[PDB]
Amino acid sequence: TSDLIPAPPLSKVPLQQNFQDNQFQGKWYVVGLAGNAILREDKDPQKMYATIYEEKEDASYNVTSVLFRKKKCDYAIRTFVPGCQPGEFTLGNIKSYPGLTSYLVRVVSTNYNQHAMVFFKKVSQNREYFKITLYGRTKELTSELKNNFIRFSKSLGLPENHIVFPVPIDQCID
Amino acid sequence: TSDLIPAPPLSKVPLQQNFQDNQFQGKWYVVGLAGNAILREDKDPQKMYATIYEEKEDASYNVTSVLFRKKKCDYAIRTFVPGCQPGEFTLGNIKSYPGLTSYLVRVVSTNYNQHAMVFFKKVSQNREYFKITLYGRTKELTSELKNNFIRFSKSLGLPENHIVFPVPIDQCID
Ligand SMILES: *[C@@H]1O[C@H](CO)[C@@H](O[C@@H]2O[C@H](CO)[C@@H](O[C@@H]3O[C@H](CO)[C@@H](O)[C@H](O)[C@@H]3O)[C@H](O)[C@H]2NC(C)=O)[C@H](O)[C@H]1NC(C)=O
Numbered sequence: 001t002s003d004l005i006p007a008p009p010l011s012k013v014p015l016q017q018n019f020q021d022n023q024f025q026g027k028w029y030v031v032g033l034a035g036n037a038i039l040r041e042d043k044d045p046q047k048m049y050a051t052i053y054e055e056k057e058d059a060s061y062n063v064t065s066v067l068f069r070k071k072k073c074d075y076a077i078r079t080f081v082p083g084c085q086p087g088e089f090t091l092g093n094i095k096s097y098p099g100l101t102s103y104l105v106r107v108v109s110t111n112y113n114q115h116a117m118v119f120f121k122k123v124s125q126n127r128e129y130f131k132i133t134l135y136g137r138t139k140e141l142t143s144e145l146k147n148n149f150i151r152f153s154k155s156l157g158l159p160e161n162h163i164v165f166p167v168p169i170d171q172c173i174d
Numbered sequence: 175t176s177d178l179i180p181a182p183p184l185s186k187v188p189l190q191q192n193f194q195d196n197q198f199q200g201k202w203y204v205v206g207l208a209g210n211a212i213l214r215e216d217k218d219p220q221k222m223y224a225t226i227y228e229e230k231e232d233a234s235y236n237v238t239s240v241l242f243r244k245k246k247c248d249y250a251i252r253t254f255v256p257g258c259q260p261g262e263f264t265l266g267n268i269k270s271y272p273g274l275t276s277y278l279v280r281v282v283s284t285n286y287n288q289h290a291m292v293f294f295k296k297v298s299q300n301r302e303y304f305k306i307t308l309y310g311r312t313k314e315l316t317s318e319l320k321n322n323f324i325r326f327s328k329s330l331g332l333p334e335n336h337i338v339f340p341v342p343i344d345q346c347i348d
């Protein structure tokens with residue numbers, strides 16, 4: 001419409017236990033993706049993309065994403081500074097984005113050598129978008145994972161058409 | 175019925191003194207609400223919503239409201255152009271609403287750091303609706319305020335069942 005599905009209350013978003021810095025780092029493929037602003041576009045199905053978590057010196061993350069947007073490889077670099085709890089981050093520099101008023105990152109779950117589920121929320125110019133990414137160390141998607149993902153999203157108020165699974169492409173991202 | 179309670183004569187609607195531009199701006203929560211077209215719906219109690227007064231360059235107001243209508247966050251943006259007296263505004267663009275013939279806004283009272291009471295009137299397709307909003311800088315509602323609000327409405331010919339107090343929700347509006 002012109003409307004947006006409410007971001008769930010934080011209490012509904014789990015936080016990994018004993019989140020480990022250096023074990024979560026490295027390349028992560030986005031095999032699952034969902035959010036109030038994410039939608040299924042059959043005309044242009046969403047393509048898989050990778051995101052790299054580089055552990056800096058002061059424990060921050062130099063996060064680089066490699067997407068395949070319209071004929072070319074796009075690169076999004078941004079740093080995630082630690083939050084109040086291991087596994088929580090805020091967007092560094094924030095001022096560099098005069099339109100942003102808040103941006104949180106919450107690692108809901110992970111095993112570090114296979115998959116992960118990360119929650120993102122950010123209010124901008126008075127709009128409250130949020131999303132969940134299903135990370136895979138490989139491009140593989142297990143039916144169990146997929147389902148357990150769809151469940152979390154729904155538990156967050158996300159209808160089916162707001163839950164997408166990027167087509168593995170294998171280019172610009174390998 | 176099919177009828178509507180008359181809008182009071184303007185003489186019955188006070189206007190704040192020395193209304194201050196930049197001091198009234200910012201986020202306002204709607205803790206009190208009343209009007210000839212507003213009614214108590216126990217089946218669906220009215221939820222609290224916010225309205226933002228953004229002071230533009232040419233002193234106009236970029237007014238944005240964030241409501242929680244049926245599962246989603248709704249956003250209503252409109253500009254309030256100054257009227258004949260500090261604290262009075264008319265709806266900009268008006269033509270963009272071929273059905274509207276008049277729309278006035280009158281800040282009846284405010285302290286800028288706590289509360290405010292604003293009057294709205296607009297004739298549309300020959301119907302004369304009007305309403306009063308009780309603004310709070312926070313979601314708090316003091317018994318004194320509440321009562322002093324109910325009094326103003328009644329003084330305007332508004333029965334009790336036309337005086338509503340939105341349920342604080344704290345979502346889509348924070
Ligand atoms: C965070 O990670 C990204 C990469 O994931 C780092 O960006 C990379 O920065 C290097 C050095 O600035 C870039 O390489 C240089 O590229 C230029 C041409 O653009 C070339 O002339 C140089 O010889 C060199 O190859 C690299 O292209 C760039 N990669 C991306 C994807 O932008 C970034 O520096 C990291 N941040 C920190 C603080 O380490």
Ligand SMILES: *[C@@H]1O[C@H](CO)[C@@H](O[C@@H]2O[C@H](CO)[C@@H](O[C@@H]3O[C@H](CO)[C@@H](O)[C@H](O)[C@@H]3O)[C@H](O)[C@H]2NC(C)=O)[C@H](O)[C@H]1NC(C)=O
Nearest residue numbers: 099124125126127226228230236237238239249250251252
């Ligand atoms: C009056 O205030 C409202 C906000 O209270 C302003 O609307 C906001 O406008 C910005 C920029 O046009 C929107 O942000 C952009 O959203 C798109 C997606 O819709 C995104 O692709 C852009 O990168 C950027 O984030 C913002 O969503 C929108 N907010 C709302 C609630 O509609 C409006 O522009 C203000 N009027 C003036 C004259 O400043």
Ligand SMILES: CCCCCCCCCC(=O)O
Nearest residue numbers: 030051065097100120122133
């Ligand atoms: C203000 C810009 C931030 C982009 C918002 C979310 C991106 C999350 C990264 C990812 O999908 O792995």
Ligand SMILES: CCCCCCCCCC(=O)O
Nearest residue numbers: 204225239271274294296307
């Ligand atoms: C023609 C549409 C105008 C809507 C009428 C009244 C809205 C007042 C704003 C508020 O409640 O804070």
